[PDB]
Amino acid sequence: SKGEELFTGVVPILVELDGDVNGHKFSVSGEGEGDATYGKLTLKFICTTGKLPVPWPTLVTTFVQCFSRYPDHMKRHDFFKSAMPEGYVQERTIFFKDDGNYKTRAEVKFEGDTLVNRIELKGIDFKEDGNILGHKLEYNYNSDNVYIMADKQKNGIKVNFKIRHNIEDGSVQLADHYQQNTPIGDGPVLLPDNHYLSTQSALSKDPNEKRDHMVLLEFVTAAGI
């Protein structure tokens, strides 16, 4: 249940985002593959409109939790795969402490054999010379644990978690995330007991790529039950 079966091998992934942060318009395309059996994601994103007006790490959480590795004993709490292939809607508000906020709306679903994440991102109230529009964030990412809770009312899940981005001066730029997911289908889905997803993310660059981009490798495992 139910995308369960859809995820037993390596699945191609496509990500497309249209963004507007303080009027700075930009688009990003990402490609790669996920192997949920190992909770592994490998992806390369390209800013297709010239330079990315925000730091790449600020976009990682926005750029497919159905690739998390759910231990066999926890399969019944895997809301993400259960919503497939029809997919789910994912919305967030990300408040950057002492700075602006991003509001995103994405749909994650299969297109044939490819798992697609299409997102619209809107950012407002950013400080022109703050850590974001001013690009003062280091190109790295910290590991973390986010707590997935069922949202029985909408038959989806909700998550509230903090991401800390390292600032070049040694300090931290907090990004408080509030997320809610609901199934696209009318299809049944599995509602989970509370548990965590533990993620680790490594960012890198493609020595041969001249466009603004980001190479991302992640491993994610569910636990807490």
Rounded Cα–Cα distance for residues 140 and 130 (Å): 18
Residue 34, SS3?
strand
* Residue 171: CB atoms within 10 Å: 11
Using the Cα atoms of residue 192, residue 40, residue 179 and residue 188 in order, give the sign of their dihedral: negative
Distances (CA, A) of 113 to 69, 88, 175: 19, 16, 33
User: Which residues contact residue 81 at a Cβ distance below 8 angstroms, ignoring those fewer than 6 apart?
Assistant: 1, 2, 3, 4, 6, 7, 36, 66, 70
Whether omega before 85 lies within 30 degrees of 0, making that bond cis, reads: yes
Q: Encoding tokens for residue 60?
A: 């990682």
- Hey, what's the torsion of the CAs at 40, 61, 197, 177, to 10 degrees? 180
Strands in 76-194 per DSSP E: 88-96, 101-111, 114-124, 144-151, 156-166, 172-183
Rounded Cα–Cα distance for residues 105 and 205 (Å): 27
Q: Encoding tokens for residue 76?
A: 């019944």
- One-letter amino acid at 192 equals P
Distances (CA, A) of 43 to 12, 136, 153: 10, 24, 34
Rounded Cα–Cα distance for residues 140 and 202 (Å): 7
Rounded Cα–Cα distance for residues 27 and 131 (Å): 21
Q: How was this structure determined?
A: X-ray
Please list every residue in the chain followed by a chain break, i.e. its C lies more than 2.5 Å from the next written N. Answer: 63
> What single DSSP character describes residue 69?
B
Domain count, the chain: 1
Rounded Cα–Cα distance for residues 225 and 213 (Å): 37
Is 12:93 a contact under the CB 8 Å cutoff? no
**For strand 156-166 and strand 101-111, is the pairing parallel, antiparallel, or unpaired?**
unpaired
Instruction: From 69, 74, 87, 65, select the one nearest 189 (Cα to Cα).
Output: 87
Residue 36, SS3?
helix
Residue 74, SS3?
helix
Q: What is the CATH number of the domain that holds 34?
A: 2.40.155.10
* Residue 29: CB atoms within 10 Å: 14
> Which residue segment(s) compose the domain that 68 sits in?
1-225
The residue to which tokens 């991302």 are assigned: 216
Is 89:181 a contact under the CB 8 Å cutoff? yes
- Tell me the chain's radius of gyration from C-alpha atoms: 17
Sequence length of the chain is 225
Resolution in A: 1.5
Rounded Cα–Cα distance for residues 87 and 203 (Å): 27
Residue 23, SS3?
coil
- Identify any residues that bridge with 119 across adjacent strands, giving them in sequence order: 17, 106
**For strand 195-204 and strand 101-111, is the pairing parallel, antiparallel, or unpaired?**
unpaired
Is 51:63 a contact under the CB 8 Å cutoff? no
